[PDB]
Design a protein around this ligand. Structure first.
Ligand SMILES: CCCCCCCCCCCCCCCCC[C@@H](O)O[C@H](CO[C@H](O)CCCCCCCCCCCCCCC)COP(=O)(O)OCC[N+](C)(C)C
Lengths: 69, 57
């Protein structure tokens, strides 16, 4: 029965190790991702949460009938 | 915010041109022909400095 239907304990042992490594890395990635989102939303210095401002190319830099702009 | 600096009344004094607008309009073409250089210098100062206090002379 063991020879025909099953494998040795090493396969399950090392598959468990691989699965555990993947799961732990995903957990730490999720925690880091939440922290990064919080910091970016608080400070606004990252690529995320970049809310639009007025484009400066719309300004007209020509004389304006009056010296004082 | 700071104190706004203003010229004294003494250096704002000048010999005024005391002719009415019709006289000025009658003379205007020759006036713009003859007095072009100082007028243009003043108006360049005016649109560059953007400050009346910097173009008094
Ligand atoms: C000497 C007399 C006493 C002997 C009694 C022996 C007791 C065993 C008999 C009972 C049958 C066991 C139940 C089957 C469950 C096994 C399912 C699974 O585990 O088997 C797969 C293998 O598949 C097997 O072929 C299972 C086939 C069993 C199908 C049962 C059908 C029987 C129904 C009878 C119908 C008869 C005719 C009907 C007429 C109408 C494993 O997949 P695999 O990943 O590859 O194997 C990994 C191990 N390796 C790497 C070493 C290969």
């Amino acid at each position: 029965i063991a020879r025909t239907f099953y494998d040795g304990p090493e396969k399950n042992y090392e598959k468990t190790m691989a699965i555990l490594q993947i799961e732990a890395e995903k957990a730490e990635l999720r925690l880091k991702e939440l922290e990064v989102r919080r910091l970016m939303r608080a400070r606004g210095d990252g690529p995320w949460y970049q809310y639009p401002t007025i484009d400066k190319a719309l300004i007209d830099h020509s004389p304006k009938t009056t010296p004082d702009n | 915010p700071g104190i706004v600096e203003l010229p004294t009344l003494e250096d704002l004094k000048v010999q005024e041109v005391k002719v009415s607008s019709s006289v000025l309009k009658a003379a205007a073409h020759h006036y713009g022909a003859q007095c072009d250089k100082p007028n243009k210098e003043f108006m360049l100062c005016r649109w560059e400095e953007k400050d009346p206090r910097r173009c008094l002379e």
